[PDB]
Write a structure and sequence with these properties.
This is part of a larger assembly, with chains A (68 residues) and B (118 residues). Chain A has 68 residues and is mainly beta. Chain A is built from no helices and three strands. Chain B has 118 residues and is mostly helical. Chain B is 56% helix and 0% strand. Chain B is built from eight helices and no strands. Chain B starts with a helix and ends in a 10-residue tail after the last helix. Classes of the chains: A mainly beta (68), B mainly alpha (118). Chain B: This is Vacuolar protein sorting-associated protein 8. Chain B: Required for localization and recycling of the CPY sorting receptor (VPS10) to the late-Golgi compartment. Involved in the retention of proteins to the late-Golgi. Plays an integral role in the complex vacuolar protein sorting process. Chain B: Belongs to the VPS8 family.
Chain lengths: 68, 118
């Protein structure tokens, strides 16, 4: 999954200006046992996901705005 | 009603406050009090509002920290803040608790810990 939050507004804090969108946080949830696999940050955004591999193992791919 | 406040800069008299007090909006009052930085009466509104909604249930300990985040160097109008804290010590422990109250009062004033023997 991919998560976009862009800060959080509340009465206690003050919004100085148009805050830049915090870059997407990526989670990999796991079935059976309950655990969180990974949580890191990416550069700009996500365009599309391929996520294929012919071998026994499988790999995923992401494409950002500038392209990584 | 919130959006009219910047346009309503031509009138900010206490008469507008009376109607909001009568109908108990409990949000526009806090928003207005944040502007002039009075911080005294709004502090009462921190515990006066029995209901919770969105203004409460978030940063309950941190709302008290934010309202107490005032007059760093000296007294600077916070004497009435100390007096209203002293006059309402008993019910304050009911809401916040015990372990958090001593931590909050530790960095503010040791003499506020004196009002415990009653």
């Amino acid at each position: 999954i991919v998560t976009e939050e862009t800060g959080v507004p509340t009465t206690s804090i003050s919004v100085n200006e148009l805050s830049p969108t915090i870059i997407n946080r990526i989670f990999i949830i796991d079935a059976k046992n309950k655990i969180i696999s990974l949580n890191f940050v990416v550069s700009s955004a996500i365009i599309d996901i391929f996520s294929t591999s012919q071998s026994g193992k499988n790999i995923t791919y992401l494409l950002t705005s500038e392209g990584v | 009603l919130e959006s009219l406040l910047p346009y309503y800069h031509s009138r900010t008299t206490e008469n507008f406050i009376l109607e909001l007090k009568e109908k108990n909006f409990n949000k526009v009052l806090f928003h207005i009090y944040k502007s002039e930085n009075k911080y005294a009466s709004a502090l009462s509104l921190i515990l006066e509002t029995k209901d919770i909604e969105k203004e409460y249930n978030t940063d309950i300990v941190s709302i008290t920290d934010y309202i107490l985040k005032k007059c760093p160097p000296g007294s600077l109008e916070c004497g009435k803040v100390t007096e209203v804290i002293e006059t309402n010590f008993d019910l304050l422990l009911s809401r916040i608790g015990i372990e958090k109250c001593v931590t909050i009062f530790s960095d503010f004033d040791y003499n506020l810990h004196q009002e415990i023997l009653e």
